[PDB]
Amino acid sequence: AAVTCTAPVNIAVIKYWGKRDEELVLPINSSLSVTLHQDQLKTTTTAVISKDFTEDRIWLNGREEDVGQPRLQACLREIRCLARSCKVHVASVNNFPTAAGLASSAAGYACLAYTLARVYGVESDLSEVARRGSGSACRSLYGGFVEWQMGEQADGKDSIARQVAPESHWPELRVLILVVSAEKKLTGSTVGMRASVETSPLLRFRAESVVPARMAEMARCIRERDFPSFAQLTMKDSNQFHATCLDTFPPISYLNAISWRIIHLVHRFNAHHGDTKVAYTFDAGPNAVIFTLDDTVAEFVAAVWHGFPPGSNGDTFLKGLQVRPAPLSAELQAALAMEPTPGGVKYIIVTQVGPGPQILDDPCAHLLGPDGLP
Amino acid sequence: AVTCTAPVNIAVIKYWGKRDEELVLPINSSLSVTLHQDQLKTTTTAVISKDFTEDRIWLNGREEDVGQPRLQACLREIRCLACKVHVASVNNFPTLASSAAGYACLAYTLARVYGVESDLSEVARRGSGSACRSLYGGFVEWQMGEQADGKDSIARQVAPESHWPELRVLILVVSAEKKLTGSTVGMRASVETSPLLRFRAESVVPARMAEMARCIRERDFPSFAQLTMKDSNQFHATCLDTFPPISYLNAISWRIIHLVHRFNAHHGDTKVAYTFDAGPNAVIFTLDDTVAEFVAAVWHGFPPGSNGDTFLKGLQVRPAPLSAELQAALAMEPTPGGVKYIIVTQVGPGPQILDDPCAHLLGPDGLP
């Protein structure tokens, strides 16, 4: 009998950047993230076991990756090592474009750990299982606001994930992913964070005497639902992450011209309202992740539309949660003070805080057919 | 009736952030290289108007307000060292640190007009922080100082211009737009909001000053180059760690950066270095024997158009035809017009006194 689950992606507000152990995958600092809603973004994963299967084979979007990959190996190990009816088959897919944003690896391994976890009846906490596949994958194991504890034990056993606050905790929070125009071939995050660790004297200071306090401060902002404090912290930590990339040698560059016009749009927007109503955060690419409350989504989206008009359609420019087009104040439009960049923004994914991985209950949803694919 | 010229300089260990706004005192020391006045220079003529209504000043032919706070502070400071002066200035700096070159020249000229003993570090610093590093030639240091009265926050020569004859400097003037944030306001903002800047000044800069000095001393280019690049990068990192964040590097800046690393990688050695100030313009450091090839690399990366008739300025140099291997290694598609032009210079001497009677920027009045 096949089993199928779905998993979410998550956006780090206190960024994870740099490993202290590349083998067990342990971070030099802890991280705090927000789980996005599977209604909008998700990874579907189907697993089936045995009958003396034609080995262990895993499918992703179509291409039949290899089980030899050191990452899958480590993952397949943890689950099987935790199993205290042999061969396994897995097929997974997702609904987020490879252009969309990042955090696709985490989601994928989170769903992998969850699906297989229950293909063996593993009731245990499988953070370690997902972590070995993808560091930040453990944060996608719970819904709402999740932290990835760097861990203190060299055996990488306490470097797990824990919920800071459930989905229902902040019903008003909203998340926007602004997929920007970009050609620049980006350096990978695994390869790049390694170079930052080997060469960035500022990265060492960030982890030793900066993050710990920010983690605590951020957990506090979430419990109290203090947006301005949440927003500020998020921007300063996004900025510091990219700062350490610039301090790496050779320097790394993920933000492009569009990234900056957006950064500047957010600060001008906030200054006009004389209040921190919007926040931005960037991962290892130029796409912008925007955090804002439900009551300010429409006006802010109307603002990006003004700054980066798609060039007639409106269709597919807004995806996910429904946003009603709002008009722009003349004073607000002036405060933005920025000539438009047509096409600057490909499209906008609108979502909210979501739950942890889900278990499906429809046979028609299984990804693996009565044997293979589809 | 005195005319002088002063040079600009490029900091290799960046000065960024003050510990005292009024006295212009840094939170860390800095080291720069004095570029030759044969390529870039500010000319300043001061005349003690034995009797004219107030003090007047002209910059490139346009009269400015002698009431600017920095100008006055500079005036009071030197006028202290010892009357009723008229000043005129000009420079061949197309619209970098033209400000430091300006006060170093004003302080040096007036110093001669009033016949002030010596050491204009403080007079210059009060006009523009980095100006004090333009009072000496070669490789100069701006010691941050231990005294709160800031009398020991001055310039100190690390080596004369004759020390590294081979070193060359290129200034790639890039096409840019975004109204840049001024450096005074920018760095003040950094000191108030950037936690990485504090760590930079407390535990990084000090040691880097020592190694930079050691690289110059031993003419160890590759080490001098890497450190220069790492510090340019850390400066811009603390700018981004500022809240709101500050951005000086643009797309062309990054292409040039990538170009440099690729060039070095192809040759299996650090032969070129870049450093960026509060703007997207790139300052390149490289030895004399590799400028021709690097110039050709830039030309190929950013073709000037009109066969670059006015693409190369300063020290004459002909690009070296690029090999097919080098082009493939740089792996960069063309960016026509990316670089408006390249200025070629080298290490130069401190400010100079112009003995030619025909050089005065103003006769017995204040006009051409």
Report the 3 state secondary structure along A235-302. HHHHHHHHHHHHCCCCCCCCCCHHHHHHHHHHHHHHHHHCCCCEEEECCCCCCEEEEEEHHHHHHHHH
| Residue list, annotated binding site of B for (R)-5-diphosphomevalonate | 15-18, 70, 128-133, 184
Cβ atoms B18, B188 nearer than 8 A: yes
The DSSP bridge pattern shows strands B42-48 and B85-91 to be antiparallel
Q: Measuring CA to CA, which residue among B67, B164, B69, B80 is closest to residue B119?
A: B80
The DSSP bridge pattern shows strands A345-352 and A318-320 to be parallel
Query: How many contacts (CB atoms, under 8 Å) link A and B?
Result: 67
Give me the residues paired with residue A10 across strands.
A35
Q: How far is A149 from chain B (nearest CA, A)?
A: 23
A137 annotated to a ligand binding site: yes
Residue type for position A354: G
Residues within 8 A of A (CB atoms), B 239-268 only: 240-245, 247, 250-251, 254, 257, 261
Q: How many residues are recorded in chain A? A: 374
- Tell me whether residues B233 and A247 touch, CB distance under 8 A: yes
Cβ atoms A228, A171 nearer than 8 A: no
Cβ atoms B135, B142 nearer than 8 A: no
Residue type for position A205: F
Q: What is the DSSP string of B31-61?
A: EEEEBPTTTS-EEEEEEE-TT-SS-EEEETT
- Tell me whether residues B247 and A240 touch, CB distance under 8 A: no
Q: CA A174, CA A72: separation in Å to the nearest integer?
A: 33
Out of A243, A264, A267, the one facing B237 most closely (by C-beta) is: A243
* Residues of B whose CB is below 8 A from A246: 233-234, 236-237, 240
CA distances from A190 to A130, A194, A195 (A): 16, 6, 9
Can you state the angle between helices A211-223 and A201-209, rounded to 10 degrees?
50
Q: CA A164, CA A228: separation in Å to the nearest integer?
A: 19
Helix runs in chain B, H state only = 69-81, 98-113, 121-125, 183-193, 195-199, 205-217, 221-240, 251-267, 288-301, 324-330
CATH topology for the A166-360 domain: Alpha-Beta Plaits (3.30.70)
Q: How far is A251 from chain B (nearest CA, A)?
A: 7
CA distances from A69 to A20, A66, A75, A135, B296 (A): 21, 6, 10, 16, 43
A77 near B CB under 8 A? no
Cβ atoms B288, B272 nearer than 8 A: no
Which are the contacts of B214, defined by CB distance < 8 A and separation ≥ 6? B220
Torsion-angle region of A60 (φ positive above 0: left; ψ -120 to 50: alpha; else: beta): beta
Q: Which residue of B has its CA nearest to A245?
A: B237
* Residues of B whose CB is below 8 A from A240: 195-196, 240-241
* Residues of B whose CB is below 8 A from A257: 250-251
A324 annotated to a ligand binding site: no
A181 near B CB under 8 A? no
Discontinuities in chain B with C to N beyond 2.5 Å fall right after 82, 95
State whether CATH 3.30.230.10 applies to domain B1-159+355-368: yes
Q: Measuring CA to CA, which residue among A98, A131, A117 is closest to residue A21?
A: A131
Q: What CATH architecture applies to the domain A1-165+361-374?
A: 2-Layer Sandwich (3.30)
B321 near A CB under 8 A? no
Domain boundaries, chain A: 1-165+361-374, 166-360
Q: CA A36, CA A102: separation in Å to the nearest integer?
A: 13
Question: DSSP 3-state assignment of B210?
Answer: helix
Q: CA A77, CA A126: separation in Å to the nearest integer?
A: 12
Q: CA A296, CA A277: separation in Å to the nearest integer?
A: 7
Q: CA B52, CA B46: separation in Å to the nearest integer?
A: 13
Q: How far is A239 from chain B (nearest CA, A)?
A: 5
- B167-204 b/e (C-beta count within 10 Å ≥ 16 → b): bbbbbbbbeeeeeebebbebbebbbeebbbbebbbeeb
Helix (H) or strand (E) holding A318: strand A318-320
Q: Measuring CA to CA, which residue among A113, A109, A93, A117 is closest to residue A44?
A: A93
Q: CA A44, CA A107: separation in Å to the nearest integer?
A: 10
Residues within 8 A of B (CB atoms), A 11-70 only: none
Question: DSSP 3-state assignment of A174?
Answer: strand
Q: What is B160-354's CATH number, 3.40.50.720, 3.20.20.450, 2.20.25.190, 3.30.70.890?
A: 3.30.70.890
* Residues of B whose CB is below 8 A from A206: 196
Phi/psi of residue B291, nearest 5 degrees:
-65, -45
- B301-318 b/e (C-beta count within 10 Å ≥ 16 → b): bbbbeeeeeebbbbbebe
Out of B178, B204, B242, the one facing A201 most closely (by C-beta) is: B204
A65: exposed, middle or buried (Cβ count in 10 Å: 0-12, 13-18, 19+)? middle
Which are the contacts of A181, defined by CB distance < 8 A and separation ≥ 6? A258, A343, A344, A345, A346
Experimentally, the structure was elucidated by X-ray
Cβ atoms A144, A165 nearer than 8 A: yes
Tokens 């020249």 identify what position? Answer: B105
Q: CA A173, CA A224: separation in Å to the nearest integer?
A: 13
